[PDB]
Amino acid sequence: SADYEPNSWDYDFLLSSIEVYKDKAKKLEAEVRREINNEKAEFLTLLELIDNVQRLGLGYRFESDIRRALDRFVSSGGFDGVTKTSLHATALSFRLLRQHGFEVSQEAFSGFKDQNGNFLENLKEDTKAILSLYEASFLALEGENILDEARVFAISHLKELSEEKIGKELAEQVNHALELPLHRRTQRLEAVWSIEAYRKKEDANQVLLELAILDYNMIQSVYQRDLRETSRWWRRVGLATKLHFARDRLIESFYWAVGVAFEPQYSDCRNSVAKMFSFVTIIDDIYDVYGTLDELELFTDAVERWDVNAINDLPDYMKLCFLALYNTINEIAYDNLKDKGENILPYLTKAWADLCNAFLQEAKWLYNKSTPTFDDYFGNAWKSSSGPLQLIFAYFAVVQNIKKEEIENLQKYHDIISRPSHIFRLCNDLASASAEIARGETANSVSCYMRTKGISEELATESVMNLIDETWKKMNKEKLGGSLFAKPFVETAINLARQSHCTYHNGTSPDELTRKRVLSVITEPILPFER
Numbered sequence: 001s002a003d004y005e006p007n008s009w010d011y012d013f014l015l016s017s018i019e020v021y022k023d024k025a026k027k028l029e030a031e032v033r034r035e036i037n038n039e040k041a042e043f044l045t046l047l048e049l050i051d052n053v054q055r056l057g058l059g060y061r062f063e064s065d066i067r068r069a070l071d072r073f074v075s076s077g078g079f080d081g082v083t084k085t086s087l088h089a090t091a092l093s094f095r096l097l098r099q100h101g102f103e104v105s106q107e108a109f110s111g112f113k114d115q116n117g118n119f120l121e122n123l124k125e126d127t128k129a130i131l132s133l134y135e136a137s138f139l140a141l142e143g144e145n146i147l148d149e150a151r152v153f154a155i156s157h158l159k160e161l162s163e164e165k166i167g168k169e170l171a172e173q174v175n176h177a178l179e180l181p182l183h184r185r186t187q188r189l190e191a192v193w194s195i196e197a198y199r200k201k202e203d204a205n206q207v208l209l210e211l212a213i214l215d216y217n218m219i220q221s222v223y224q225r226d227l228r229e230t231s232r233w234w235r236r237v238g239l240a241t242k243l244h245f246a247r248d249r250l251i252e253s254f255y256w257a258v259g260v261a262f263e264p265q266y267s268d269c270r271n272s273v274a275k276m277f278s279f280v281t282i283i284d285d286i287y288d289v290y291g292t293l294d295e296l297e298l299f300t301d302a303v304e305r306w307d308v309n310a311i312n313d314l315p316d317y318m319k320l321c322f323l324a325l326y327n328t329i330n331e332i333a334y335d336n337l338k339d340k341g342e343n344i345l346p347y348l349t350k351a352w353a354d355l356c357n358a359f360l361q362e363a364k365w366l367y368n369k370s371t372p373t374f375d376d377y378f379g380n381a382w383k384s385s386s387g388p389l390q391l392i393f394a395y396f397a398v399v400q401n402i403k404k405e406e407i408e409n410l411q412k413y414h415d416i417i418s419r420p421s422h423i424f425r426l427c428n429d430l431a432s433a434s435a436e437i438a439r440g441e442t443a444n445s446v447s448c449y450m451r452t453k454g455i456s457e458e459l460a461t462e463s464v465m466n467l468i469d470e471t472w473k474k475m476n477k478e479k480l481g482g483s484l485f486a487k488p489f490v491e492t493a494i495n496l497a498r499q500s501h502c503t504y505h506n507g508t509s510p511d512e513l514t515r516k517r518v519l520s521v522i523t524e525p526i527l528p529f530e531r
Contacts (some may be wrong), residue, residue, distance in 0.1 A: 056190025259499025387421030
């Protein structure tokens, strides 16, 4: 059928003094759509265009155009011949195809090996192709050994590189890929970086470049508006000021939400997740350092009973904390009862009851100086991260028609939200591993892994790294098909993982990097286009 219905992100709506900005955005967008649709353009060129469009942060806007292009690139058999011509073309086309649900085999790289079954060592000459292969390897599924091998062959060459041999441009490109592959970096962060990079190319498509900048700043404006309303709500609750021991992480929480749902039409999800993580921060502090087991026991009990007529059992500080959570969640339940005509309160309260219990378990292991095996510890840790609770709330804010089966699967911690949480927990612990280890702390996935396997931090650190890689492959299959959930929500879940990779780094300085990123994504707009 024909679809003439409007999009929640069309400039005609998002840009309703400004009339000037709208017309230009639409004109630029029109020309870009024409290019992606160019029926007579060199295939490799078409693919490189799609790649920039996406890297610059505009893929969500030309989603159907790109699928259409990839479709005729396959039917015409342009892909079959490419897998025999260039490595760069194969890898790039492979990544874009798999990314868009297309069925591709790892055997498309078998033609770049030798009799020994190894990639031709001379391929390292074309650094560009090596970068492409690298990026594509990350979309590997379980079993695809060729891709795993390709990732190895790629990193070897990229590390042994230098600006002097490839140039300041390609060099900056290699360092970026290594820092974090495209498939794992959040879309908003990758866009800021690519836009700064593209605007320096002497042959960069000006129309596309202006559109990227204009669109990026437009979306950022929504975030600022979103954060403004949420900052008002937060300050209204005043929970952060009344609890002298608690730390305020509203801005950091919002930054985190942007990684989960960057599309402008997702303000609710963005706000729901920002608010939720904000409460998680305070409650986490309550169980981690402030509360005594007797009190923690009472609070946990209160969240399970979800009875407002029993807050007088809690000590003053928890009494305030509990009522704030109680109302906030009931608020969200109301919104859903009003919009979807469904009572989801049980699902939201269960998520919170579960989290608190995970927090309680850690408080107990800590108090009793217990030493659970990695499996028991981690099993509890990926839940205490709040990752699945955040996804359960995201669900109701992302899907229009909720399905009893889907929510029941989320309630059972289906792979869709558990896998990303595994990564969430692992990236957090990895970043603080060295610190907590040299301090005698054992409450950390890496530390726990060390004790459970009896190996060095270096050894354990690698094991955790490989653990993440495996999780990504299983996570990639979920999105590729055979999922109970709609692909849109599968991507949301995965974004939690992506955000995890970005908010947890080694270090520019660590605290310095977290400041720059939050500013480049929320506060400071991108410098206007220069002709």
